[PDB]
């Protein structure tokens, strides 16, 4: 069967989007079964760049968090190197490598989380799992995936029993109303791949549970860690053998599951949708690295990461640039601010909302409009993906060949949803195969000495910037210090990068960019329009703070 | 098929992490609550429907034969006619207000919807209430940023098989929020010995000293975190930070600056 598509021309508005973080709706007008046009209306506004003025700078990382509890840690972990930045202190290398680890934890967490409990129930039709003979799901697992208990014909029998009881009782509660109730076009997978995938959708539960204890080892609690500080971390006990041990334990387990299921399931996937390989790209991709040797200052970062900072333009592999923070700005010709705020540089933010009406083409979203030399930008997995792989970076460059070799597509098949889905596999994947080794690294490191927090002072006036890339992407927060307080405070955020509106040239972002030439099977039930936007991992949390 | 209770949970002004705290409950695992314990019949994080047929689903839970009760994540923004948080088109205060009239109660998961949270704090841009406020009825606070699981699942589990838990002034189950932070925590024999660390870097500070002189609100914030920790391994204050009392009231604006007593 080639991909389906109805003869639908009309418009088509998705509000709730569902299975993201925040609140987003998209409109798209169609023709003839094929996405025209696209709008991404973010629809909460909080402000905490207004709340943040006249504060004191040392607060600002508790308040920032709160950006978004999803990719919790990342904004305090942006703000401490902000204003780490800002003062002008070197954290100790313990406190590097506390951090990163904290990092790579939220990555497996956010990761694992994303693909089964948000992204999956649009490609996998739960109900036609219950079509399936466990048995024989067995044996399709048992012949294309790692061996494990898991997966047997009684744990299989025993899950699609689970689902039978829950579907005949009536009351299908979080799958009422699915898009695949029925039967739908565009779900693709037999039913012995669906009960599999349901199996490990109930086995991820518990699992994020493990990879959060984890975290919390180092970050205090999860969500919201509470182990930062200026100057580094005040976490000791995460520096001790016997946490750091569990640590480890407790990640082995996570990245098990990782190899076991995700990747497999993964891969499964992108095979029965290997058309998806050629719907939903962009041209620009953005990063500003992360896992850095060199935390010393914003340049060193961006020249350090182990995932390596860049900017591709046009698709071209061939010429990775370096990134020049001075070239980022924020329009707001599109958004719901105050006119006059156009093409400013971050350090210069001006947050004045304005709120018109509903669906106004002229002003339909609460995020800005952030670009970069007037480009849009692609962040995120697949972002690091590219530039990683364009640079020779040698995992990288192990983990995707295998992806092409098992899918035989080529590299430019990445560029596309099903690439930008496949990206996030790729590295949860190399996370993990680093974990032991950066564990080993600050257990040795601590064990010698245990500085973890460096001296600073708090200068009258200046100014710093913290560079991450968090899960979705290139995230960087911008100080104003001035009166030893906050003049201004800015969050340019991933997916106010992918998701936010168009810029002052009418330029359409990359969700927008990647919705146009979706095909759309249904036009009552349009799971092509999530598949894509989901493929992102938008936060309109993160995206409009 | 006995019947499970349907529960329907509304996300407004919010970062989520409050949903994510719920999912982290091992008493019982989050999957075994939806399939054995509640009917989750709304729930925007992990939902298959989208759109109207998301917004469909809600409305058929509201209109139950059995009747719901209702969780509420995140604050209400009012200013604009409460134009600047909207769901499906509505503003949230309309569709909280909504569903709250007909639920057999409300629990508030979170500071944010129990007294307003983050985007209420000054100087609140959007003019954002917590729900008891907006709406004008009492709500089974849970507070905390986020709260604790055990808290919240505890107090729902309660909620439909024991009635309401005995509150405090401020809404809060007194089997979570009846003892102070503070009297709980394993540095207390510091503070009550003056033994403090003045930083972060200080020796005081490898030696676990007590936190007070760098903020701690421990003193003055009613939860369980010591008692019961996170995640099953830790808490704020074991790895080594004050406590920003994120389970009071408009702490945004009474414990700030956070690092200070001031
Ligand atoms: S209470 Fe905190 S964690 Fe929960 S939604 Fe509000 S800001 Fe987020
Ligand atoms: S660290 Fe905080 S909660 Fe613990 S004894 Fe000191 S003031 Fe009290
Ligand atoms: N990852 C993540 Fe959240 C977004 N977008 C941030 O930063
Ligand atoms: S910050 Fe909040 S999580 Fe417990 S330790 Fe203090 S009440
Ligand atoms: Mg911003
Ligand atoms: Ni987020």
């Given at each position: ?6 003869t ?7 509000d ?33 760049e ?29 703000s ?11 954290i100790?290398a ?12 939220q ?12 992204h ?19 044996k ?10 898991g ?42 791949v ?9 086995e ?13 080892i ?7 860690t509470?182990?930062?500080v ?23 387990e996570?990245?098990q ?13 992108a095979?029965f ?9 962009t041209?620009?991709?953005?990063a ?7 935390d ?31 070239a ?13 705020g ?23 979203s ?23 792989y ?7 460059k192990?983990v ?20 930008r ?7 949860t ?35 710093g ?46 969700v927008?960019?990647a ?25 309109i949390?993160?995206?409009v703070? | 098929?006995?019947?499970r ?28 609550l ?14 298959a ?49 909504k ?18 949270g ?32 055990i808290?919240?699942v505890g107090?729902?589990?309660h ?14 189950p007194?089997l979570?929020?009846?003892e ?26 490898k ?23 996170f ?32």
């Open positions: 069967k080639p991909t389906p598509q109805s639908f021309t009309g418009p088509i508005v998705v709730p989007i569902t299975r993201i973080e925040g609140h987003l709706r998209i409109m798209v007008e169609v023709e003839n079964g094929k996405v025209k046009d696209a709008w991404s209306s973010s629809q909460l506004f909080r402000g905490l207004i709340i943040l003025k006249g504060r004191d700078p040392r607060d600002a990382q508790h308040f920032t968090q709160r950006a978004c509890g999803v990719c919790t840690y990342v904004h305090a972990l942006a401490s190197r902000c204003v780490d930045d800002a003062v002008k202190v070197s100790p313990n406190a590097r490598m506390m951090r990163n680890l904290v990092m790579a934890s990555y497996l967490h956010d990761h694992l989380v994303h693909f089964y409990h948000l999956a129930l649009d490609w996998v039709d739960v109900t036609a799992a219950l079509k399936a003979d466990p048995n024989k799901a067995a399709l697992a048992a012949s294309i995936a790692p061996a494990r208990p997966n047997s014909a009684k744990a299989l029998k025993a899950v699609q029993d689970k689902l039978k009881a829950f579907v005949e009782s009536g009351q299908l509660g979080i799958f009422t109303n699915a898009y695949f109730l029925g039967g739908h076009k565009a779900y693709y997978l037999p039913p012995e669906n009960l599999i995938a349901t199996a490990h959708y109930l991820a539960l518990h699992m994020q549970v493990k990879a959060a204890s984890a975290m919390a180092l970050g205090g609690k999860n969500p919201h509470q182990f930062t200026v100057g580094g971390c005040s976490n000791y006990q995460g520096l001790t053998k016997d946490p750091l041990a569990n640590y480890l334990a407790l990640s082995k996570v990245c599951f990782v190899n076991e299921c995700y990747i497999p399931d993964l891969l499964a996937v095979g949708y290997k058309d998806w390989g050629g719907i939903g790209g041209s620009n991709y953005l500003f690295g992360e896992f850095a040797t060199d010393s200052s914003p340049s060193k970062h961006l020249a350090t990461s182990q995932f390596p900072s860049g900017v591709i333009t046009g698709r071209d592999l061939g010429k990775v640039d370096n990134v020049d923070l001075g980022i700005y924020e329009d707001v010709k599109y958004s719901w601010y105050a006119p006059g156009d093409g400013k540089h971050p350090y210069d933010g001006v947050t004045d909302p304005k709120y018109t009406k509903l669906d106004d083409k002229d002003h339909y609460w995020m800005k409009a952030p670009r970069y030399k007037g480009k849009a930008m692609e962040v995120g997995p697949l972002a690091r993906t590219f530039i990683a364009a640079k020779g970076q040698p995992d990288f192990k995707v060949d295998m992806v092409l070799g098992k899918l035989s597509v080529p590299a430019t098949a990445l560029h596309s949803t099903l690439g889905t496949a990206a996030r596999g790729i590295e994947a190399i996370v993990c195969a680093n974990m032991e080794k950066w564990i080993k690294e600050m257990a040795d490191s601590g064990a010698k000495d245990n500085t973890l927090c460096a001296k600073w002072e708090m200068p009258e006036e200046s100014k910037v913290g560079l991450a890339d968090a899960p979705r992407g290139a995230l960087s927060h911008w100080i104003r210090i001035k009166g030893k307080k906050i003049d201004n405070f800015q969050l340019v955020v991933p997916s106010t990068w992918n998701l936010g509106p168009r810029g002052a040239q009418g330029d359409k972002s990359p927008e960019e919705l146009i030439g979706t095909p759309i099977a249904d036009p009552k039930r349009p799971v092509e329009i999530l598949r894509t936007v989901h493929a992102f991992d938008p936060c949390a993160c995206g703070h | 098929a006995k019947h209770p349907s529960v329907v949970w509304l996300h407004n002004a919010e970062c989520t992490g409050c949903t994510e705290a719920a999912i982290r409950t091992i008493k019982p695992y989050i999957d075994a939806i399939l054995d314990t509640i009917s989750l019949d709304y729930q925007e994080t992990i939902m429907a989208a759109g109207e047929a998301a917004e469909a689903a809600l409305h058929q839970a509201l209109e139950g034969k059995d009747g719901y009760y209702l969780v509420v994540e995140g604050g209400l923004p009012t200013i604009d006619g409460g134009q600047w948080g909207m769901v499906a088109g509505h503003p949230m205060i309309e569709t909280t207000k569903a709250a009239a007909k639920a057999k109660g409300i629990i508030c998961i979170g500071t944010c919807s129990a007294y307003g983050v985007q209420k704090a000054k100087p609140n841009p959007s003019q954002a209430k917590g729900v008891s406020e907006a709406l004008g009825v009492k709500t089974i606070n849970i507070p905390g940023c986020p709260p604790n699981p808290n919240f107090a729902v589990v909620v439909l098989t024991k009635g309401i838990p005995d509150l405090d002034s401020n809404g809060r007194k979570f929020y009846g102070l932070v503070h009297d709980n925590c394993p540095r207390l024999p510091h503070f009550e010995a003056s033994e403090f660390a003045p930083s972060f870097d200080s020796e005081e500070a030696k676990g000293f007590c936190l007070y002189e760098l903020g701690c609100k421990g003193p003055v914030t009613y939860n369980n975190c010591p008692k019961v920790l995640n099953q391994v830790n808490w704020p204050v074991q790895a080594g930070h004050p406590c920003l009392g994120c389970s009071e009231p408009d702490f945004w604006d009474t414990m700030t600056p956070f690092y200070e007593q001031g």
